[PDB]
Design a protein around this nucleic acid. Sequence first.
RNA 1: GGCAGAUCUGAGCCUGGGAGCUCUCUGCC
Length: 14
Amino acid sequence: RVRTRKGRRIRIXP
RNA sequence: GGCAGAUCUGAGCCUGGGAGCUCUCUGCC
């Protein structure tokens, strides 16, 4: 999974 | 009862410069 946190890039596994 | 998503539109350390983690929540038979 790939998402963005507080504008930052956060990725979690798939 | 276990599973599956979500980041400010989920937060916490950023060790994040984001595959780093960490935790909570919802519906199913």
